[PDB]
């Protein structure tokens, strides 16, 4: 199907405990492939997936230099935003940024993203036109005027339509045996009695990649949305993900319930029931 590349920047101040820490991680779809940590004994952009290891010295040196520059730029930016909100020098604050591109099955740009947050709240976002800005408040308006004056959107657009798309296509080819392989969920249904009156049916999915999945319970063919305990999809540690959905049913009505599973690894969607 379609694919994404994203970089996630976290910049965190810590007054009294040194200068602010800057972390960058890069992903293709749900696969992390690089990291940088300004707290590391020797800070550098480092591989976190096997298919990136073949990149040469120019790549690692460029990505390391930009990240080290970013460490300084984000430190100044944290000082700036503290001023914009009249905040004390004693508190710890966070700038987060995520940017990247989505491409379709033919590798064509579907859209680009660049969004920032400050202490967990929307701060400023590049619009889908990759030309204009949305500032969340009068503090972010100061950033917006700085960035318009510097023609930042034009630089972000060049990257999002240029390098981001080109390198994503390159990564997808170098890592095709994993990045372009969908592993279907292994599924099963369990039955845990609660009382003489009801029991829990839990519908499991294990070992799937990527993380996107749809698990739903129906009773007499009707989705039990309000009645389904959905757990957050979770990583197994081997690149794959796990998920379950649970519904509480009256004893003896178990056969009126079906679990439905949609995942791009699956030849066709799955319908499951409890098999005692």
């Amino acid at each position: 199907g379609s694919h994404s590349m994203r970089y996630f920047y976290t910049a965190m101040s810590r007054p009294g405990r040194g200068e602010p820490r800057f972390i960058a991680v890069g992903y293709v779809d749900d696969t992390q492939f690089v990291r940088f940590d300004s707290d590391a004994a020797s800070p550098r952009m480092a591989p976190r997936a096997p298919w990136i290891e073949q990149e040469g010295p120019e790549y690692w040196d460029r990505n390391t230099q930009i990240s080290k520059t970013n460490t300084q730029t984000y430190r100044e930016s944290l000082r700036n935003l503290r001023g914009y909100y009249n905040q004390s020098e004693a508190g710890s604050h966070i700038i987060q940024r995520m940017y990247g591109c989505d491409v379709g099955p033919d590798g064509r740009l579907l859209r680009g993203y660049d969004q920032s947050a400050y202490d967990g709240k929307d701060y400023i976002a590049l619009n889908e036109d990759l030309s204009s800005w949305t500032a969340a408040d009068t503090a972010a308006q100061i950033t917006q005027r700085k960035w318009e004056a510097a023609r930042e959107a034009e630089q972000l657009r060049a990257y999002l339509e240029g390098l981001c798309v080109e390198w994503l296509r390159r990564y997808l080819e170098n890592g095709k045996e994993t990045l372009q392989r969908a592993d279907p969920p292994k599924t099963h249904v369990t039955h845990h009695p609660i009382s003489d009156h009801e029991a829990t049916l839990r519908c499991w999915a294990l070992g799937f990649y990527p993380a996107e999945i749809t698990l739903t319970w129906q009773r007499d063919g009707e989705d039990q949305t309000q009645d389904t305990e959905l757990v957050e999809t979770r990583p197994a540690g081997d690149r794959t993900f796990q998920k379950w959905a649970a519904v509480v049913v009256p004893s003896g009505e178990e056969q009126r319930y079906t679990c439905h599973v949609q995942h791009e690894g699956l030849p066709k969607p799955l319908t499951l029931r409890w098999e005692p």
């Binding site: 991680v25 992390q32 757990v231 957050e232 990583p235």
Partner: protein, 99 residues
């Protein structure tokens, strides 16, 4: 404005006594990013526990995976202990071996 961590404790593979596996503690949905996570074997902290690099979801909340190699037994009891600025006292979540 701050957000308390969600915590899930589970094994990489289905658990079988005597078979090597991985014990996972996944913390997500939290803000800010400083968090303390330990894995407990019958109450005591397991020494060499790794974790993923810091990243965050679409709503800006953070997530991390803490994990270690282990061999479950019928005796041994495992758990995850999480501390975060939103928590008065550390939260302990036990590994539930079936559900």
């Amino acid at each position: 404005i701050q957000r308390t961590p969600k915590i899930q404790v589970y094994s990489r593979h289905p658990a079988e006594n005597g078979k090597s596996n991985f014990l996972n503690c996944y913390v997500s949905g939290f803000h800010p990013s400083d968090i303390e996570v330990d894995l407990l074997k019958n109450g005591e902290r397991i020494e060499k526990v790794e974790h993923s690099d810091l990243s965050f979801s679409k709503d800006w909340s953070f997530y991390l995976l803490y994990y270690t190699e282990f061999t479950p037994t019928e005796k041994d009891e495992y758990a995850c202990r999480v501390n975060h600025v939103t928590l008065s006292q550390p939260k302990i979540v036990k590994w539930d071996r079936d559900m």
